[PDB]
Design a protein around this ligand. Structure first.
Ligand SMILES: Nc1ncnc2c1ncn2[C@@H]1O[C@H](COP(=O)(O)OP(=O)(O)NP(=O)(O)O)[C@@H](O)[C@H]1O
Ligand SMILES: Nc1ncnc2c1ncn2[C@@H]1O[C@H](COP(=O)(O)OP(=O)(O)NP(=O)(O)O)[C@@H](O)[C@H]1O
Ligand SMILES: Nc1ncnc2c1ncn2[C@@H]1O[C@H](COP(=O)(O)OP(=O)(O)NP(=O)(O)O)[C@@H](O)[C@H]1O
Ligand SMILES: [Mg+2]
Lengths: 50, 300, 150, 301, 648, 50
């Protein structure tokens, strides 16, 4: 879908999508979650305990 | 005040509200332009519901809610008022006019008259009010319409059922369809108006031959004439659905007769040319076919 | 012709110049109706009933009335590819009359000429006009002056 | 290729690549031949050069080096209540799904969808079997398909609480060549393809088998004739797999054909004498009418 | 059977044909006649058939009878598929006839209501008739879905033996004698198939090779003339040639349906012609030719000669009268198209006339109409509607939203004048509604019921106006690309390949018109002198080269030469006649020079007036050079001037 | 400036909806009465998604 150039300039456009280009990222997450857990956990709570 | 500004304008709109009206041939005054107010009411209602979101709305909630309750009851009657009209109009052509058809349906008609008169009174008072919103204050308006639409639907249903039960007595009627069938049911006085339809329920046969008391035969779309053995006797008052069934059986019986007569002639060894003059096509054909088969059988 | 060719300048000039012809200005739009054209005429015209030609639609006086459709090729095409408003100009030109749409009765035009101006179908926004219309009008190309003229 | 080309050498790649290109009509040429460093590849080219194509193709599968997962292995191992198994019309997986059912946890329910009645009983027994837990099988779902869009599509979808119900599995038989099934409904279910293609002798045995269960409505000659027809069916049936060799197009010959062919035979047998002559008009009916009726191309006739 | 080698061969061949047997046993006579084929038996229902047009016996029709009898034996529906131009529906009909049944037929995608389809099906199951769905392959998703499901309810119930069945949310009883047949026409994708639900309840069979030859032989044989076999082969082979050699065209049908039209339209010509090939030749060029174009006409003629060799005076003298009256010249072509039309109008109720702008399509039907009025004495009422000017609402009519009141449109109102109330007499006259504009699927979809065999106009309120035979419909249009193939098969088609008229003839016609336009408001003294001046001032020999150089040139918004003529003549005439008053005292040389100047100018504008203005100048030189050298030369700015206060 | 959310499956539309609760008012550019129903949301402070 094509929006007017007028909208796209004025507007902050965000892609929530899985384009298959998201796979590289997502299999790493799974890989890391299942391989090195403690640094996936302490990847997540990095802001929490801080 | 973001609110009173809107509420005033809904009111200002509905005090000038007007249905356009043109009466049809006799009695009931119809309304043109339904969708306009059905929309505008739906739109203003939505504006009133969403108003409840406002933070300054709390104190004015009453003055809003009263308007909501009034418009909501207009909507209740609009939804009904339109279908009452639509159904009635559709039924008037079938019921209120033609005397013969309303004759065999004393009942659906007997109800239609009363509904009509009542719907006439209520509408006539309604358009005397010179405003549409005012309609909500008419005693037994909403009730009248709901009773009316329900009753009309009960008639429409009854009619549909009546016809479908009518076809099942002479299933060929399923080829006609409603309009023409009603013409047959009513014209069963005359018997001559049934002839038109004999292409549609048989297709082989075009029209039907009378001695004015009795039915002597039929004539096919080709122009062939099939004379029945037994002429079909008719009395001044007799249902079509009966003698039509007698006819349908007698044309088959008649074809069979011509078949055996002609075939027996050919068996006795008359020339085919002799026969060609004296019988209808179908009979002399099956004759030739059966006899042939027998001959080329022994010839084998 | 191209822009600045002088089409609108010269023809409005010619028709305003002579007393014998008066103009009815119309600017066709890619959305335009037959009913715009008719209403465009109704200020300068009057319907009459004449047993000779039945219903007639002449100008309100004696001298002739010329309808000028500027940007005449712009009106759009039906899904099936036909622009009715042009075919209507055609019906006027070939049959010298038209059906009055609501009442189903034949109208005959009197002392009304149809004339138009436009840019070549080659340009964007312009639509092809059928030879069934254009056969009835003489077509003149109009272009930039001799430049010595300029 | 995707894997090895990464792991293995450039001479490996160009060899496997040229060897594939030979299987295709892409190019024909001898691979860079390394000696015993790559054993398997010499094993592959050996398949390509001796013109045995099947084993050449499944070289990759056996060098892929896996255990393939049986229908049984998918069904049992998979956690989901919904399976659609498509197949060519040539074969149906009902008889297999029966045996897979008897083999584990019983509960075989075969629901044909013929009628309005078969459809009501379908959706009655669905709502019944999903509370009770039995296996429910909807045969050739494609024929009712306006039913699926309205009822089934939403009735699988709108429920994620179907897992909260007992151990219950709904099977849907599909056809690969046939009307497209709604993409969301399909993705919602575990998909499989039923490929199992009987031998000719097998098919003859199974046809011949289904017949003696009918008792005897016929004499001794009809049996001989039933025998022949089983053979004839098995052979035609087989020829359709051949595709351009044998039959020009894909033709499907169902049980409807076999029934009609045998019905004709019983008739021509009952109507005539015990002489062996009637065979003249037996061929022509089966060839031109019964079986060959379906056929538009004169070659195939 | 005679020529069979062996007694066994005879029995086989005997077994492939329908045999008609009669039980001498009992009462219940109507069940006493049955049919044996392939060793399967079928009883004869005695429904009255009349005298239908009976199909020629060919082995394909017999095999079709065999597959159908094979199916019904087990109470499966039979189904036919195969390309358009064989026959299927009509084969099922004859199959019904042979067993003494009238088959009811549903033509599909006829814009039919599902209600009427449902209802007919209910009738057929209760009655127990045989239904046939013509072109079942095309039906809408929801329509086909529902009809199909009902057909399985029926077919299933027949196999099972149910006394009553349930369908569509309607319950009905079921006659054991009910049956449903289906014919399927192919799309570009390949031969159509039954929806999955019915695939198991039917038996599919192919209709392939119609055996056009044997059909033609026997039909030619019942007209009983000359060489039935020879003419058959030559005619069939010839249509075959026509299909092979002539260009592929969307609307060309050389099939068995066209061949039958030839054999049947061959019959009337027999009276004033012989029964020889000559009649066959005449029938062919009457049926085939009108549709064919430039090349394809000469192909028809070339391949016609290669195979078989080769109201006239009255009508042609009336046409000549009609052309002579409107100012039209009678050519080979113009007369040709007129005659083609005249013979079309007798057969075809709706006619389609196709050709480029300025073809003379209008001139043709108007002239042929006018000449029939002369000839037949039947007066003609002509309504010319430019179609796409009006919306469907405006043309056919419409209904008010609320009050459900009907209002007639243009077409319906002028139809009502004809039927419901005739103050005068429309009885003895012919009416012609002419649609001048481009025809699109939508408008004919509305009136396709008119074009139909139903001959009734269908309005949304269900007013169902019948249509008399006095009522004839014309479509004159330039292109057929967007019309329905069905609209064409319903109408007759008259194609205009080239202009009906020679360029000089049109010029001559225009001049006549311009002269007669003057004849009303001017004296005969001036008219004679001037019309002599104009006509003899320019000759076709000069002009033809000019029109030819006009053809080599760049025309912005170009109109072909033939159509520019109207501008040419009318400009010239009016221009010359504008100055008529100064010709009394004018010298004899000077005028010819003046006439020539006024004509050169008008000929310039009418031809090159749409050119670049550089090209205008080049074309002026082309006009001076191709007319007389002595004749007054035209210049860019050249003009005639006359003095203010005095004549000069 | 106004966010423009893009997802092929719109789970994000129910994310915003879960965030603001009942407050969310969902409109479309293709629906008929949209123009007014926007005028309603905007005046009384509803959270809009188009
Ligand atoms: N002799 C002239 N006298 C006056 N103005 C002239 C003359 N020649 C050219 N022009 C100019 O030409 C222009 C006229 O453009 P005009 O033809 O009226 O628009 P147009 O015909 O509609 N072309 P287009 O824009 O494509 O529709 C003006 O700027 C005039 O000043
Ligand atoms: N054996 C035959 N004898 C005489 N006419 C035949 C025979 N077979 C076909 N025809 C004619 O061939 C034409 C084909 O028409 P029809 O039977 O309607 O074709 P269809 O396959 O049923 N539908 P369509 O192919 O689209 O026209 C008709 O004019 C038939 O009369
Ligand atoms: N036979 C003829 N002899 C001489 N002039 C003719 C002849 N036929 C037509 N004309 C002239 O050439 C013109 C051709 O136009 P017309 O007869 O209307 O055909 P047409 O195809 O209907 N034009 P159109 O409706 O735009 O497609 C006529 O208007 C006459 O002026
Ligand atoms: Mg014309």
């Amino acid at each position: 879908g094509d929006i007017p150039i007028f909208l796209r300039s004025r507007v902050r456009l965000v892609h929530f999508v899985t384009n298959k280009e998201s796979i590289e990222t997502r299999i790493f997450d799974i890989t890391l979650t299942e391989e090195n857990a403690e640094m996936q956990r302490k990847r997540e709570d990095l802001i929490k305990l801080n | 005040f973001v609110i009173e500004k809107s509420l005033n304008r809904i009111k200002k709109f509905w005090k000038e509200a007007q249905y356009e009206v043109i009466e049809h041939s006799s009695g009931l005054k119809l309304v043109r332009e339904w969708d306009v107010l059905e929309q505008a009411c739906k739109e203003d209602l939505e504006e009133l519901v969403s108003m409840k979101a406002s933070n300054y709305y709390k104190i004015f909630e009453q003055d809003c809610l009263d308007l909501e309750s009034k418009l909501t009851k207009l909507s209740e009657i609009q939804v009904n008022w339109v279908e009452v009209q639509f159904y009635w109009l559709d039924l008037y052509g079938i019921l209120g006019e033609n005397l013969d058809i309303q004759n065999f349906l004393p009942l659906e008609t007997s109800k239609f008259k009363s509904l009509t008169s009542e719907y006439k009174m209520i509408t006539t008072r309604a358009f005397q009010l010179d405003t549409t919103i005012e309609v909500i204050h008419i005693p037994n308006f909403d009730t009248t319409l709901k009773l009316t639409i329900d009753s009309l639907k009960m008639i429409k249903s009854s009619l549909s059922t009546f016809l479908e039960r009518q076809r099942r007595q002479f299933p060929r009627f399923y080829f006609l369809g409603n309009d023409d069938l009603l013409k047959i049911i009513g014209s069963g006085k005359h018997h001559d108006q049934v002839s038109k339809f004999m292409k549609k329920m048989f297709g082989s046969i075009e029209s039907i031959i009378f001695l004015e008391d009795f039915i002597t035969g039929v004539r096919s779309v080709e122009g062939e004439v099939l004379n029945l053995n037994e002429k079909i006797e008719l009395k001044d008052s007799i249902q079509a659905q009966e003698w039509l069934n007698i006819l349908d059986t007698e044309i088959k019986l008649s074809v069979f007769t011509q078949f055996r007569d002609c075939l027996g002639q050919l068996k006795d060894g008359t020339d085919i040319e002799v026969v060609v003059s004296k019988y209808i096509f179908q009979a002399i054909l099956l004759s030739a076919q059966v006899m042939w088969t027998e001959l080329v059988e022994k010839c084998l | 012709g191209p822009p600045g060719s002088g089409k609108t300048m010269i023809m409005n000039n010619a028709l305003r110049n002579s007393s014998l012809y008066d103009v009815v200005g119309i600017n066709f739009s890619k959305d335009t109706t037959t009913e715009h054209i008719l209403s465009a005429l109704h200020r300068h015209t009057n319907y009459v009933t004449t047993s000779k030609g039945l219903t007639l639609l002449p100008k309100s006086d004696i001298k002739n009335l010329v309808l000028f459709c500027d940007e005449i090729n712009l009106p759009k095409l039906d899904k099936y590819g036909s622009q009715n408003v042009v075919l209507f100009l055609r019906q006027l030109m070939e049959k010298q009359g038209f059906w009055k749409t609501p009442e189903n009765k034949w109208v005959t035009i009197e002392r009304i000429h149809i004339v138009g101006a436009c840019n070549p179908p080659t340009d964007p926004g312009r639509i092809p006009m059928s030879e069934r219309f254009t056969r009835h009008a003489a077509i003149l190309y109009l272009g930039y002056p001799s430049g010595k003229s300029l | 290729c995707l894997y090895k080309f990464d792991i293995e050498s450039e001479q490996y790649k160009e060899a496997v690549l040229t060897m594939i290109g030979v299987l295709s009509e892409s190019s024909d040429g001898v691979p860079k031949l390394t000696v015993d460093t790559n054993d398997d590849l010499r094993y592959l080219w050996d398949y390509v050069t001796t013109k045995s194509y099947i084993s050449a193709l499944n070289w990759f599968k056996n060098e892929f080096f896996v255990d393939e997962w049986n229908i049984a292995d998918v069904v049992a191992n998979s956690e989901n209540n919904y399976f659609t198994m498509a197949s060519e019309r040539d074969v149906d997986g009902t008889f297999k799904l029966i045996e897979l059912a008897k083999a584990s946890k019983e509960s075989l329910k075969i629901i044909p969808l013929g009628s309005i009645e078969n459809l009501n009983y379908a959706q009655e027994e669905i709502s019944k079997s999903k509370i009770e837990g039995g296996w429910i099988l909807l045969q050739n779902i494609q024929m009712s398909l306006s039913w699926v869009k309205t009822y089934l599509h939403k009735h699988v979808e709108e429920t994620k609480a179907a897992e909260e119900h007992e151990k219950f599995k709904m099977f849907m038989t599909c056809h690969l060549t046939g009307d497209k099934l709604p993409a969301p409904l399909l993705q919602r279910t575990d998909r499989v393809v039923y490929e199992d293609i009987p031998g000719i002798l097998d098919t003859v045995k199974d046809l011949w088998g289904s017949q003696f269960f009918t008792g005897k409505i016929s004499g001794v000659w009809s049996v001989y004739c039933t025998f022949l027809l089983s053979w004839f069916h098995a052979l035609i049936t087989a020829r359709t797999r051949l595709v351009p060799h044998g039959f020009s197009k894909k033709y499907y010959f169902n049980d409807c054909d076999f029934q009609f062919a045998s019905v004709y035979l019983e008739n021509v047998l009952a109507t005539n004498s015990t002489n062996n002559i009637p065979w003249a008009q037996v061929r022509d009916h089966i060839a031109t009418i019964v079986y060959g009726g379906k056929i538009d191309e004169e070659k195939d006739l | 059977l005679k020529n069979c080698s062996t007694k066994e061969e005879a029995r086989l061949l005997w077994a492939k044909v329908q045999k008609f047997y009669q039980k001498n046993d009992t009462l219940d006579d109507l069940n006493s006649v049955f049919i044996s084929q392939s060793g399967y038996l079928l009883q004869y229902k005695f429904e009255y058939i009349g005298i239908p047009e009976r199909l020629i016996y060919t082995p394909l029709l017999l095999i079709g009878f065999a597959t159908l009898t094979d199916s019904l034996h087990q109470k499966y529906g039979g189904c036919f598929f195969g390309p358009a131009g064989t026959g299927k529906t009509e084969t099922v009909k004859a199959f019904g006839q042979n067993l003494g049944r009238v088959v009811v037929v549903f033509n599909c995608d006829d814009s039919f209501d599902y209600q009427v389809l449902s209802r007919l099906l209910v009738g057929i199951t209760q009655i127990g008739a045989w239904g046939c769905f013509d072109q079942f392959n095309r039906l809408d998703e929801k329509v086909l879905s529902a009809v199909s499901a009902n057909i399985q309810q029926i077919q299933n119930g027949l196999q099972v033996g149910k006394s009553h069945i349930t369908l569509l949310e309607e319950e009905t009883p079921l006659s054991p004698h009910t049956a449903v047949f289906i014919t399927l026409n192919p799309g570009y994708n390949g031969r159509s198939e039954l929806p999955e639900n019915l695939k198991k309840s039917f038996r599919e069979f192919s209709m392939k090779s119609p055996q056009s030859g044997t059909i033609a032989e026997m039909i030619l044989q019942i007209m009983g003339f000359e060489d039935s076999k020879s003419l058959a082969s030559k005619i069939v082979h010839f249509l075959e040639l026509l299909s092979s050699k002539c260009s592929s065209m969307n609307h060309y049908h050389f099939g068995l349906r066209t061949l039958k039209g030839v054999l049947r339209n061959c019959s009337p010509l027999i009276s004033e012609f012989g029964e020889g090939e000559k009649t066959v030749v005449e029938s062919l060029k009457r049926v085939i030719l009108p549709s064919l174009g430039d090349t394809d006409e000469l192909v028809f003629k070339d391949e016609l000669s290669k195979i078989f060799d080769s109201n006239s005076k009255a009508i042609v003298q009336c046409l000549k009268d009609a052309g002579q009256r409107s100012g039209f010249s009678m050519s080979e072509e113009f007369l040709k198209k007129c005659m083609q039309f005249y013979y079309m109008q007798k057969t075809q109720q709706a006619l389609i006339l196709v050709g480029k702008a300025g073809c003379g399509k209008t001139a043709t039907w108007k002239t042929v109409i006018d000449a029939m009025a002369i000839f037949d004495g039947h007066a003609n009422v002509v309504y010319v509607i430019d179609t796409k000017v009006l919306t469907k609402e405006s043309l056919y009519g419409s209904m008010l939203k609320a009050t459900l009141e009907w209002r007639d449109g243009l077409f319906t109102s002028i139809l009502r004048r004809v039927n419901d109330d005739i103050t005068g007499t429309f009885k003895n006259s012919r009416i012609w509604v002419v649609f001048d504009s481009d025809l699109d699927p939508e408008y004919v979809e509305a009136m396709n019921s008119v074009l139909d065999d139903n001959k009734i106009l269908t309005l949304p309120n269900g007013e169902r106006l019948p249509i008399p035979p006095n009522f004839r419909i014309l479509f004159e249009t330039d292109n057929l690309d967007h019309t329905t193939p069905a609209t064409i098969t319903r109408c007759g088609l008259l194609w205009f390949s080239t202009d009906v008229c020679s360029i000089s003839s049109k010029i001559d016609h225009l001049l006549n018109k311009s002269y007669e336009a003057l004849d009303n408001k001017l004296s005969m003294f001036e008219l004679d002198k001037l019309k002599d001046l104009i006509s003899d001032s320019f000759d076709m020999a000069s002009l033809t080269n000019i029109f030819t150089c006009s053809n080599d040139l760049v025309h912005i918004l170009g109109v072909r030469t033939f159509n520019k003529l109207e501008t040419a003549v009318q400009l010239a005439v009016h221009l010359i006649s504008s100055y008529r008053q100064w010709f009394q005292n004018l010298d004899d040389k000077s005028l010819k020079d003046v006439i020539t100047l006024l004509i050169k100018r008008s000929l310039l504008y009418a031809l090159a007036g749409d050119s670049t203005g550089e090209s205008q100048r080049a074309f002026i030189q082309t006009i001076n050079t191709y007319f007389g050298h002595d004749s007054q030369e035209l210049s860019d700015y050249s003009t005639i001037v006359i003095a203010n206060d005095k004549l000069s | 400036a106004v966010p423009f959310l893009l997802d092929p499956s719109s789970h994000m539309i129910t994310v915003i909806s879960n965030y603001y609760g009942n407050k969310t008012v969902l409109l479309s550019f293709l629906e008929e009465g949209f123009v007014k129903r926007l005028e309603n949301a905007i005046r009384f402070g509803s959270v809009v998604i188009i």
